[PDB]
Structure 1
Amino acid sequence: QAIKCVVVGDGAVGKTCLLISYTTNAFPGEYIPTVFDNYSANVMVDGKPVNLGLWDTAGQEDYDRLRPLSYPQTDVFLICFSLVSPASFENVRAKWYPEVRHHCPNTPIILVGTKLDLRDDKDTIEKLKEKKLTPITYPQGLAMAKEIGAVKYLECSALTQRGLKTVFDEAIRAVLC
């Protein structure tokens, strides 16, 4: 079966690394592979052969006009936000939740917490406070999902794969219900 999954969310969140790590099991931090490329996958969702169509995007305002061009005929949105970026997390309601709904108000949404490793590290943890800010917790992300209407809320690290493989299994299940 064919399911179309679009990955949206503030740039820098890791939408591209999320998809390369998942589909190729490698981090793109090496040369930053082919720009604006999209990715597909074949997964077994419970004795079920599925053809996953993953659409990457660009969060910068410059593309606000040709971004919704990929939303038609979509089956499951994955609004992403960096757990290390409280700012990006705010735009989850400030920009994403609306835009996705502005076009397809009836499509399931999965909120993801990209970068679950740089949540307890010695570096950003300090400079995060340096800006009078702190990392995104389970709550307010778990409530953010509910504040929207997400069929699920997961977290993962495209650099550790922990929780990665799952994020999409949930995207698919959310589809065939």
Structure 2
Amino acid sequence: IRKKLVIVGDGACGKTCLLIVNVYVPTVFENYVADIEVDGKQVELALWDTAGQEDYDRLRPLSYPDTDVILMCFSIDSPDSLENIPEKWTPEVKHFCPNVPIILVGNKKDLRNDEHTRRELAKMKQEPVKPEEGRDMANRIGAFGYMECSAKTKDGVREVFEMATRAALQ
């Protein structure tokens, strides 16, 4: 079974690291493949990696055709990236991918309790995204589901792609 997954979300919010776990270099356009088994079904999952910068807004629609599931990411140490979910990512994805299931993914979960992150966000009167805030946003945009993960610690990563696969298969 072949299914197509596209991942989108703010620049540097952790998209490529999430794919790879399954360097400091921004992606322009890359493709990967992952094999996943869920519910007795074996799926060959094509992973379409995209650029999060607005510089590449006119390029991203090259990745959207015939998509089976969307990973829509933000980073838990970036409340800006969460605010960009309803402001930028959801309108774009729903414009180009109607009726495609969206997994809302909170990346970098390891930084929520990180003292350095909390100290640095504090200087800007910010704090890490709370789990409830992520879940509420997933509810708000009508996501297929909400998942938090850390590519760094691997926490929740397997669960993200299993959910994405089940979404694609359904």
Counterpart position of 2:9: 9
Deviation at 1:34, TM superposition (A): 8.5
Greater alpha carbon shift after TM alignment, 43-52 vs 123-132: 43-52
Larger proportion of strand: 2
Deviation at 1:33, TM superposition (A): 10
- Structure 1 residues 36 and 105, CA, compared in 2 at 3 Å: closer, same or farther? closer
Deviation at 1:80, TM superposition (A): 0.1
Q: List structure 1 runs of 4+ shifted beyond 4 angstroms.
A: 31-35
Greater alpha carbon shift after TM alignment, 141-150 vs 45-54: 45-54
What is the SS of the residue equivalent to 1:134?
Answer: coil
Deviation at 1:123, TM superposition (A): 0.7
What is the CA deviation profile of residues 103-157 of structure 1, one whole-angstrom value per residue up to 9, with x for unaligned ones?
Answer: 1221100000100001101111111010011110011210100110101000000
Counterpart position of 1:26: none
CA RMSD of aligned residues (A): 1.6
Distance 2:15 2:27 in 1: 14
Deviation at 1:49, TM superposition (A): 1.4
Give TM-score scaled by structure 1 length. 0.91
- Structure 1 residues 93 and 34, CA, compared in 2 at 3 Å: closer, same or farther? closer
**Structure 2 letter corresponding to 1:137:** K
- Structure 1 residues 167 and 65, CA, compared in 2 at 3 Å: closer, same or farther? same
Q: Is the 8 A contact 2:151 2:157 kept in 1?
A: yes
Distance 1:136 1:175 in 2: 27
Distance 1:34 1:119 in 2: 25
Give TM-score scaled by structure 2 length. 0.95
Deviation at 1:91, TM superposition (A): 0.2
Distance 1:32 1:138 in 2: 28
- Structure 1 residues 121 and 62, CA, compared in 2 at 3 Å: closer, same or farther? same
**Structure 1 residue runs without a partner (length 5+):** 23-28
Q: Is the aligned partner of 1:45 residue 2:34?
A: no
Larger proportion of helix: 2
Counterpart position of 1:65: 58
Among candidates 131, 134, 151, match of residue 127 of structure 2: 134
What is the CA deviation profile of residues 8-62 of structure 1, one whole-angstrom value per residue up to 9, with x for unaligned ones?
Answer: 000111001111111xxxxxx3x75997321111111122211001111001111
Provide the aligned length of Structure 1 versus Structure 2: 170
Distance 2:77 2:48 in 1: 23
**Structure 2 residue runs without a partner (length 5+):** none
